[PDB]
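ugh ok so i messed up the first submission bc i forgot one of the chains. this is the corrected input, ALL of the components this time, i swear. 1353 residues overall. if the numbers dont match what u have on ur side tell me asap before i send this to the collaborators (the ones from the other lab, u know who)
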Amino acid sequence: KGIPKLDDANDAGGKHSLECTLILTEGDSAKSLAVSGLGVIGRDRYGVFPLRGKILNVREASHKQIMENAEINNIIKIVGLQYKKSYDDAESLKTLRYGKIMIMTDQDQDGSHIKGLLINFIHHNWPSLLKHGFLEEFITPITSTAKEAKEYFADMERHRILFRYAGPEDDAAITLAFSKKKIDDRKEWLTNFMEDRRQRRLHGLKHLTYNDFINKELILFSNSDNERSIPSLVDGFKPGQRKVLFTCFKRNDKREVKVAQLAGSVAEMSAYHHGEQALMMTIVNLAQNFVGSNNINLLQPIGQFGTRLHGGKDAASPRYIFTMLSTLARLLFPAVDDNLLKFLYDDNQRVEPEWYIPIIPMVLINGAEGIGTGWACKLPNYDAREIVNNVRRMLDGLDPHPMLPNYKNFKGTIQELGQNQYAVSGEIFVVDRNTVEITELPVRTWTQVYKEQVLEPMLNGTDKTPALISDYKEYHTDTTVKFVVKMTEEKLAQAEAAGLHKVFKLQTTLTCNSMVLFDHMGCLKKYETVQDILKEFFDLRLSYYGLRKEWLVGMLGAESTKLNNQARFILEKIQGKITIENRSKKDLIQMLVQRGYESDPVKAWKEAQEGPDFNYILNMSLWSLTKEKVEELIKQRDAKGREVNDLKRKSPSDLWKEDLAAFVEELDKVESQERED
Amino acid sequence: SKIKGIPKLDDANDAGGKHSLECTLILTEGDSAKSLAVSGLGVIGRDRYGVFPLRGKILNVREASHKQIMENAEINNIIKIVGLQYKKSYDDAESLKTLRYGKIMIMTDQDQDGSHIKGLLINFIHHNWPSLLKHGFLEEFITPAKEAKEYFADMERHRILFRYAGPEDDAAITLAFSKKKIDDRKEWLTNFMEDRRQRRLHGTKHLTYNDFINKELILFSNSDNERSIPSLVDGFKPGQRKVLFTCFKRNDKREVKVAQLAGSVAEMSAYHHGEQALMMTIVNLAQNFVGSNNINLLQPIGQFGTRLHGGKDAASPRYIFTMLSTLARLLFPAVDDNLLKFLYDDNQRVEPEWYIPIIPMVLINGAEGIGTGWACKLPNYDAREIVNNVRRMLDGLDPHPMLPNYKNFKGTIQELGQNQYAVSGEIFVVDRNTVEITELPVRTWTQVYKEQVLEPMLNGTDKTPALISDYKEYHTDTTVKFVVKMTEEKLAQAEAAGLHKVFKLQTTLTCNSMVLFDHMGCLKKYETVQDILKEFFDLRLSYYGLRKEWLVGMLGAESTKLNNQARFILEKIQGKITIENRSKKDLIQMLVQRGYESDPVKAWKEAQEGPDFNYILNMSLWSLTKEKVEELIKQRDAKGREVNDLKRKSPSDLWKEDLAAFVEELDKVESQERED
DNA sequence: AGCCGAGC
DNA sequence: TGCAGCTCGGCT
DNA sequence: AGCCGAGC
DNA sequence: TGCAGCTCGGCT
Ligand SMILES: [Mg+2]
Ligand SMILES: [Mg+2]
Ligand SMILES: [Mg+2]
Ligand SMILES: [Mg+2]
Ligand SMILES: [Mg+2]
Ligand SMILES: [Mg+2]
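and heres the new structure output, hopefully the right one now
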């Protein structure tokens, strides 16, 4: 009676209410599948209503948020529930329009979270209903077609699982999962889970209690929530971000690509199994370059990707904005290192690696940030050039210098107040005895938000505060801040006595006591200092420069051997020592073997990293026998031989220094061109 | 005076006060244009400029119903913001004191659809307040975020005012927007198309409404027909043609998301419109329920809609996949691509002016379109009957008449006369209390029939009494089955009258507007489908002639190419020629002196408007081995035979080969569809 | 009270 | 993630 | 009173 | 085509 998306049961509200089931689905697409499966007979005792994703965690949400939540209220009216009302006896159960709620979500982790949020909602307001068997779920395999829907519902018994309340263990499990006062308990809860899962990874491998649902099904979401929200220390990426970079590297676009088009390409090439809107969000976040976002954006923002006016919220639609790799991206993630990574497999398709190994700790450059379950991560930005200098110091066996947070193009100051605590201050100075000027806001204070929440209440006053200024004007650009503020002589004197930065809200505190990351083994770890992050990154990256040299010696050696055989075959051919004309394939192969020619050395070497093949010789064109091509082939062979020796003479440290120098050169050119443009 | 219930309005600071008549309301084409306008206005612009966005085309209020005008959110928002009043004259300055803005400035894209929005706004002011046009009420802002502030700083260079100069302006606006002036629009556009052909055999700040209509809006009306009226040759409109051109170039072997393909089409074919229209077109090309396509060229992999809701129940284009049908390239043979005139956007090659299918696809899937002045509507026709008529005409026989035919339609289509048909569903008496409905007429959707026919029969429906006692549904996704219960009395009287009549199971189909573009791009009205079939036949037969001339030349060039390659290989394995350690230029001159031909395929392709022996010397060293020499000799002889076998065949023979190959796969595909 | 961002 | 208005001509 | 579909 | 709710943890 007033619920647009509701397909109410025919007998709902009448005398057969307690025999009616309300099916709450995960989204409208799931609703139509349920309505399709119920046929026509299902309308008498089954209603369908869709949930628009995650619902409110009512256990500790404010009363205002609970009263104004449309989805919670819709469920209450459809079922006929009432707050504070107990459902103990059978007399109280008559005011309900439905006797059972059947949750129908995807059989993935986020579906389990929605189930738990519904369980948390009923358990917090009507615990007596759970002891009556009010909640159940409809299981599916792994959405599907209309024909499959009617086959699931025809076999309703095999897909219907009922939740069971068995004692206070169920209350404690629900509280463990959804109470804000149980964050530390969730840390221990997940710590035991991650530890136990490693033990069995080294070895092997119709009723459901709420305690078993929390501790055996919901925990898979909570852990997966951390795996997708807490970045890796090695490359500073989360898996979704890493899939984007992997796709951009594999495409190697030389011209702009629409963000929406790229998102579709990422989902296909990297097996991204979530909605594309989140993926398009990730791409926009990876491309932003305004003050307070990325110190080095790996994707270029070609279009309106947001400004410091609205903290990037003013970005245009992803169907109208373009992007492509920054020229620094491949200097930070050298393509040769791809041969050293562990690439994952989804549906037997090879996808992104478990991590990339950049030349500097990218987790410190762009400020890794993420919210999971139990833990969260928050890192500020750090200066790329200072990071390089500390890497160069550690390569010389010296201790790295301490580092303060640093944001590109930020004109203010960041001062250390204590361990992992910092004061971030904008810029304000007195012009005359009636004027101050504000030329910088602290990091992540957006211009429009500062205007509306600080300067307008200072100009007009509120119901709780007086006016402080008489006027202000704005002279901003898209990337800078300039407020000119007018005050009386008296008010300005009082503002200076109290502190201009304090009065004008131009100083904010930055506290970094939750630097939680996945280490290189995939273990969640809390890091107390950025130096600890830098050190753990340094040893791994240096070791991989060792692996890269071993790889290059083998690969360049095989290429040298290959050119030696090809050059030998051409020289022996243009002199009459060997002939192939009108010879059979069998005789030609057995002859090349008998004369000491090697099977494809590059293919052999690549297969070693896991009949004779002379195609690398006989697929050469007939041009190969002509004079200029013989001279060209001999010079290429001799040049590769010198290339092997030049590489053998370099240390892993030398290779790292070459990469760092090449990166700094392009970083200077790009950042200088940015200031020109 | 202020406005507070319109979220998307950025009202001017002085609007509503004493400076109202000096304030300008900027109406933009969409929210993105609004944000660009507020960006360009700086800070000073907020005092005398308001901005409000229009969400696309607005209501043509001329001759629109009173209910539609009263309930239109865009029209009412404009009235509330400006302060206008219906039936009020604005002659003197005393009447102008009730307006909150003195001017409206239209800001649209400088394309045809933007011109249409300008005209629709002009039509709205002209129909209700013609006195305002005589005061200079309407103006426009021309374009060719930082660029926005530069446009507004140079405001008067971009600002053009509309001018009323006499009854020619009233007549011009009425010509464009009055339902009583369709025939005048036909004449209006016929002269334009004719005048444009003549000049292609050879080579201010005020603007009157008559010049805007006859020199700017007419460009929209014409391009509206070019994108909405299909071509006779392939049955496509340009947007549909860009999609198939893109699918052909991609040649996907696996399913592709519709939204992804739409983005691929915009890039590869220079599609300059919104993605939503393009995703519409793709879904429409893929649908295969009863009443849509007889041969869908794209496969519907996912929920593309059903006959339950006429396809409006299709899932989002982000969740459904598509791919070429195996029939598409049998209908549009790739070899014929070498005969088409491909178009150019900027400097990129895009889709052709038309494809030339082996059968008139314009009849198979029912061409349909609404333009300006004209519209097109064709029913579906049977593919096999059309193949049979093509075979008859190839043998000099007369083609059989064809009735409309819809795939999987179990009903009846009867000819009442020329271009007039009775389309009937199926209903039969089960017992003396039950009828059963097993088919609805073509394009009557199941849910619509239930709500608009069966429910009024079951319930009240105003003065008419209830006629049935109950009904049950036993539909599938592709079939219809209603079982209806009645008393013996009202069933007998319903049976006494027409059962198909009483239950609304008969619809008429009239096709007196078969308007298409002919092969030259001329708009033409066809009286019968035989006229369409004949004109298609003469063109397609001629192009099978061109295919033979093209293939004989190309296969001949390939034959010459292989002859030289085989000659070089035989002379090399015998010692008659050596290349070892010879310089490039000596080897080139040596090959010339022995009669070796420069690349014959390249020469032939350049003929269709130093020596190149790369086709010989890029061959691998494998070429000199025994098995590769025998293989090269056999390939050379097979191409020679292929050229000769082709020169003996007639263009009719090639057409019959294609038709048989098409029918063979059509039988296989349609048998697999009925199994699934 | 609300940001941050990868999910629904 | 799902959802919504209009044009234009012929026809019912 | 509204469908059909390529556009905004 | 633009628009909108929520989770989860640390912190202001
Ligand atoms: Mg899911
Ligand atoms: Mg960041
Ligand atoms: Mg446009
Ligand atoms: Mg059609
Ligand atoms: Mg009409
Ligand atoms: Mg919170």
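quick check: Residues A 106, 108, 110 surround magnesium ion (ligand 1) (CB under 6 Å). that seems consistent at least. Residues 26-27, 51-55, 62, 105-106, 110-111, 113-114, 225, 228-229, 238, 240-241, 274-275, 277-279, 281-282, 285, 311, 369-371, 376, 378, 444 of chain A lie near DNA strand C (CB under 10 Å from a C1').
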